[PDB]
């Protein structure tokens, strides 16, 4: 950790991501994840970055950022979980990280799904299901997506179950 693989690598990966034309390469996501975990002393900047990147641009970033946060979230959760997930306010470590995200996931998801279309919207929906199943954000479906009205509203002209 001698000034090697600092925020540069992280930010660099994300930046290059958006620079793409709706490609979303898993490689990038990996770098961000491994990096975050490798450096739990920067959960703030990290989580904050991905978060902003999402709400930043429309569906485009929405979907992309979503995937990124997903990977980091899972890993982070397991990490802190291994010891004890506890927090109150402001960033500090994995714990605070997950908490912060869950406090913004509302606008993030909602926006993503909305700005997203049948295709994109579909990806988000699936991801959400896996999240609950796995046990990432054990908040009993936050008000955010909680209100099915979210999908129903954004749900363009199309049949469904």
């Amino acid at each position: 950790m001698q000034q090697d693989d600092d925020f540069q690598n992280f930010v660099a990966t994300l930046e290059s991501f958006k620079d793409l034309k709706s490609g979303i390469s898993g490689s990038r996501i990996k770098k961000l994840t491994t990096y975050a975990l490798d450096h739990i002393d920067i959960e703030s900047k990290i989580i904050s970055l991905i978060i902003d990147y999402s709400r930043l641009c429309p569906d485009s970033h929405k979907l992309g950022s979503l995937y990124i946060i997903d990977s980091i979230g899972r890993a982070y959760l397991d990490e802190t979980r291994s010891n004890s997930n506890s927090s109150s306010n402001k960033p500090g470590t994995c714990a605070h990280a997950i908490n912060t995200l869950g406090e913004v996931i509302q606008e993030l998801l909602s926006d993503a799904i909305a700005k997203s279309n049948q295709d994109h919207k579909e990806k988000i929906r699936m991801l959400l299901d896996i999240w609950d199943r796995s046990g990432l954000f054990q908040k009993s479906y936050l008000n955010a997506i909680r209100s099915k009205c979210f999908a129903m509203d954004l749900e363009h002209h199309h049949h469904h179950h």
Binding site: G23, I24, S25, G26, S27, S71, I130
Partner: peptide
């Protein structure tokens, strides 16, 4: 595009 595209959350 050969770059391990399509990142699924169900698979790390």
């Amino acid at each position: 595009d050969d770059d391990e595209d399509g990142y699924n959350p169900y698979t790390l």
